[PDB]
């Protein structure tokens, strides 16, 4: 029937003055466009079919051609930016928004999907979709007493599309749009479907990826406890964005960071910092590094939750990028910590693995580690214990590495090392 049509035959059917011939040809186009191997998107665009598809979106008396055209355009918009632009340039945005209110659930859903692809292209198209008034009708589709009454695929698509309206920066989405969307997002974040939860977490991770003011908008909605709960989920597609969101939040103020701690986030970290998925371990360690950049009472919570041994662990053995985040966690800890907290660090065995990493080629991690060592020595100075530390560092081959770093070509490195040598190793 409509399987494997040539583009010329599709054009012929669409240019016929016959609505049923146009429907068949549009369906043929939809099938070409939904084939996994190189759908001929550019050939379809070149044939000038987008404006025709867009006009078909308005055919209220022929819902089948609305659906087929909506599907065809969705798949063109799913392509490159240039391909998405062709769809927008054809006037698709207002046409799809009008379709959100369709009495046909499958058509409304397709329009949600298409708008998701358009918004997903970038900040400009996202903002243009918002300007055409998409948010109101989208939110209206979710204005039900219990989300569980909605078709699963339908809910997932709405969640995903809303996440794209939250996505991207330079600029971030309009403050008013974010305020408008958040209460619905908070609701979706409490739903029970893993895909809805994952995409709700993605949206929250985008919204918290910015200045403290953007973080505050989210934190004020009280979602942190739910994020921490999702941090403990078994589904990796949920934990990944949940953890990015939590990590973003702790890049904010000390107070915003405290809400994460208050919600019990630290108790999940023994598992996160030993997680078999490398990226989870890395993001969790990054997150830890920002928490140890906090107040002394927050560093103390890290101590109380027994997380210093886990940091020693990651520093001792982990993917290198993870070890780098650990190094940062330690330097931040030593920067803001009390003498007793810093001493505890040494007692947990931080020195040897810290020394071992000085063989790294990465210039920045070397600077970070040397800073930590300087900080630790400072604490020791205030206890008259520099000698015993000097010996510790020498016993594990640390002094050898620091001595060599005087020959390091980077200025700040061969400076910092010289300073340590001439001040504690004479």
């Amino acid at each position: 029937g409509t399987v494997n049509w040539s583009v010329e035959d599709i054009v012929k059917g669409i240019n016929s003055n016959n609505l049923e011939s146009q429907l068949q040809a549009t369906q043929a186009a939809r099938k070409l466009l939904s084939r996994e191997k190189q759908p001929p998107i550019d050939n379809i665009i070149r044939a000038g079919l987008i404006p025709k598809f867009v006009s078909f979106l308005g055919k209220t008396d022929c819902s089948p051609i609305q659906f087929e055209s909506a599907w065809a355009l969705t798949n063109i918009a799913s392509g490159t930016s240039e391909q998405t632009k062709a769809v927008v340039d054809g006037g698709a945005i207002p046409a799809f928004i009008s379709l959100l209110a369709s009495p046909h659930a499958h058509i409304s859903e397709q329009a949600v999907w298409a708008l998701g692809n358009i918004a997903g292209d970038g900040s400009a198209f996202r903002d243009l979709v918002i300007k055409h008034g998409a948010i109101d009708p989208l939110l209206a589709l979710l204005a039900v007493p219990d989300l569980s009454t909605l078709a699963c695929g339908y809910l997932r698509n709405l969640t995903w599309t809303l996440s794209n309206l939250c996505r991207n920066k330079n600029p971030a989405p309009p403050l008013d749009a974010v305020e408008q969307i958040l209460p619905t997002l908070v609701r979706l974040l409490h739903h029970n479907d893993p895909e809805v939860l994952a995409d709700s977490c993605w949206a929250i991770s985008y919204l918290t990826d910015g200045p403290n003011e953007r973080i505050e908008m989210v934190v004020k909605k009280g979602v942190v406890p739910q994020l921490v709960k999702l941090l403990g989920a078994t589904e990796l597609p949920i934990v990944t964005p949940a953890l990015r969101a939590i990590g973003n939040i702790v890049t904010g103020t000390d107070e915003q960071t405290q809400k994460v701690i208050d919600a019990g986030a630290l108790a999940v970290f023994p598992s996160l910092l030993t997680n078999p998925k490398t990226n989870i371990q890395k993001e969790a360690t990054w997150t830890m590094s920002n928490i140890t950049a906090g107040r002394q009472d927050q560093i103390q919570q890290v101590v109380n939750h027994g997380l210093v041994p886990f940091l020693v662990g990651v520093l001792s053995k982990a993917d290198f990028k993870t070890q780098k985040e650990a190094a940062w966690a330690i330097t931040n800890y030593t920067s803001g910590g009390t003498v007793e907290q810093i001493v505890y660090l040494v007692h947990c065995g931080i020195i040897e693995p810290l020394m071992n990493l000085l063989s790294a080629k990465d210039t920045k991690i070397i600077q970070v580690i040397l800073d930590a060592i300087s900080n630790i020595f400072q604490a020791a100075e205030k206890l008259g214990e520099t000698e015993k530390l000097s010996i510790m560092i020498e016993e594990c081959g640390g002094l050898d590495k620091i001595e060599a770093l005087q020959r390091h070509e980077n200025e700040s490195v061969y400076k910092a090392s010289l300073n340590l040598i001439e001040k504690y190793f004479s």
């Binding site: 939904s34 996994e36 599907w71 969705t74 798949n75 918009a77 799913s78 392509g79 998405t84 397709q110 999907w113 998701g116 692809n117 997903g120 292209d121 995903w160 996440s163 794209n164 996505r167 994952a198 995409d199 993605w202 991770s205 985008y206 990826d209 990944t240 964005p241 990015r244 990590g247 973003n248 702790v250 890049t251 904010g252 993001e283 990054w286 590094s289 920002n290 140890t292 950049a293 906090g294 940062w328 330097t331 931040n332 920067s335 803001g336």
Partner: peptide
């Protein structure tokens, strides 16, 4: 003297989706 650091890498869900059926 500890400064907070934003993520080094972009992390996001799928920006666009093709409908297969």
């Amino acid at each position: 003297s500890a400064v907070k650091r934003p993520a080094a890498t972009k992390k996001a869900g799928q920006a666009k989706k093709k409908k297969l059926d």
